[PDB]
Design a protein around this ligand. Structure first.
Ligand SMILES: O=S(=O)(NCCNCc1ccccc1)c1cccc2cnccc12
Lengths: 353, 18
């Protein structure tokens, strides 16, 4: 067969150890899920430094904790805008997920609180910025470089899926690079606990699985489709399905056809054809052998999964960092004020936060 | 080229969720 006795024994034991790890990780997650933390700091404990990103119901600021001098990324959500835009459940769920997970590639939530106007989530600051910017700037990643990142998403999805969490918003814009060159996943607005199926139309057009487009009940296999899109975009510099308008992107996604740059290795194309598989009974990550079909694929043959998990692999790329609080890897935004009302807004809606 | 087609799509910038 493909493996001699020694390699087969090693792979079998590795796979059993992963099961053992996931069982313990699911136990630790559920404890924290059932009994979450609340109100662990206050606004005047931090100095505001710079806006790192803005949205329709809040923003993310680099802040410095006064006592400890540590820098953090503080997500500020306007309670009234959250309600107007129908994001109550998503916002509470994101916080609940973040306070319960624990994994080396998931951002760590260090504090959360609220006041009359806003909700606050204080997370580790990830100074390397989004993978998106580095990818557009470099053009494309070589296959070893893309594989380094892909390996981290594989392990992170293996973790999340063992907790019955579907991520649903994978894309380079949602992947930050830390000071050691490793990935941090920070946003969980669309993640859901789904043991079986779910139905919401959500995601980003280029990364939508065909069964989401076709309004089907779907499961965690949408994340493995999205991994195929991510790997393609990292290695090509552009995604596999694009067009002027989303409807034309969706026709491409459902067609079952995909084209590859001539510089893609045959191993990479074979993996991508198995992730970007419109037929759910044939998609890698959705078969009897689960995540192992992906991890044991030829394109990952040089990947030491434990070494990646332990962050012992030398990263292909370390972002420029001139010191703590360096923000050169983030876009520049106009600094708007953080007004806090004399009157509590939306207290009932955000009671559990 | 496919790259030129990608530029022509207008979707080279940061993409938001639907
Ligand atoms: O503001 S973010 O970059 N936003 C996340 C990445 N961008 C998400 C996104 C926004 C708009 C469109 C598409 C994606 C951010 C968030 C959370 C924790 C952080 C920690 N350190 C730095 C930045 C952090």
């Amino acid at each position: 067969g493909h493996m001699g006795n020694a390699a087969a024994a090693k792979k079998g034991s590795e796979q059993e150890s992963v099961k053992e790890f996931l069982a313990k990780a699911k136990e630790e997650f559920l404890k924290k899920w059932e009994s979450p933390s609340q109100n662990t700091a206050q606004l005047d404990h931090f100095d505001r430094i710079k806006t790192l990103g803005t949205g329709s119901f809040g923003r993310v600021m680099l802040v410095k904790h006064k006592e400890t001098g540590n820098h953090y990324a503080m997500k500020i959500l306007d309670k009234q805008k959250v309600v107007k835009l129908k994001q109550i459940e998503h916002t509470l769920n994101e916080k609940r997920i973040l306070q319960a997970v624990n994994f080396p590639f998931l951002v760590k939530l260090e504090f959360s609180f609220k006041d009359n106007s806003n909700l606050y989530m204080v997370m580790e600051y990830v100074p390397g910025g989004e993978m998106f910017s580095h990818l557009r700037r470099i053009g494309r990643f070589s296959e070893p470089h893309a594989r380094f990142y892909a390996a981290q998403i594989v392990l992170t999805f293996e973790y999340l899926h063992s907790l019955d969490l579907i991520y649903r918003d994978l894309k380079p814009e949602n992947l930050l690079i830390d000071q050691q060159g490793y990935i941090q996943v920070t946003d969980f607005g669309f993640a859901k606990r789904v043991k079986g199926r779910t139905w919401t139309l959500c995601g980003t057009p280029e990364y939508l699985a065909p069964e989401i487009i076709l309004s089907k009940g779907y499961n965690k296999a949408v994340d493995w489709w999205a991994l195929g899109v991510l790997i393609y975009e990292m290695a090509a510099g552009y995604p596999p399905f694009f067009a002027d308008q989303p409807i034309q992107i969706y026709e491409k996604i459902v067609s079952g056809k995909v084209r590859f740059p001539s510089h893609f290795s045959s191993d990479l194309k074979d993996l991508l054809r198995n992730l970007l598989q419109v037929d759910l009974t044939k998609r890698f990550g959705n078969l009897k052998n689960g995540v192992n079909d992906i991890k044991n694929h030829k394109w990952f043959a040089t990947t030491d999964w434990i070494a990646i998990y332990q962050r012992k692999v030398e990263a292909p790329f370390i972002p420029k960092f001139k010191g703590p609080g360096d923000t050169s890897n983030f876009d520049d935004y106009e600094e708007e004020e953080i007004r806090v009302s004399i009157n509590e807004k939306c207290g009932k809606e955000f009671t559990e936060f | 080229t496919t790259y030129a087609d990608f530029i022509a799509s207008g979707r080279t910038g940061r993409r938001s969720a639907i």
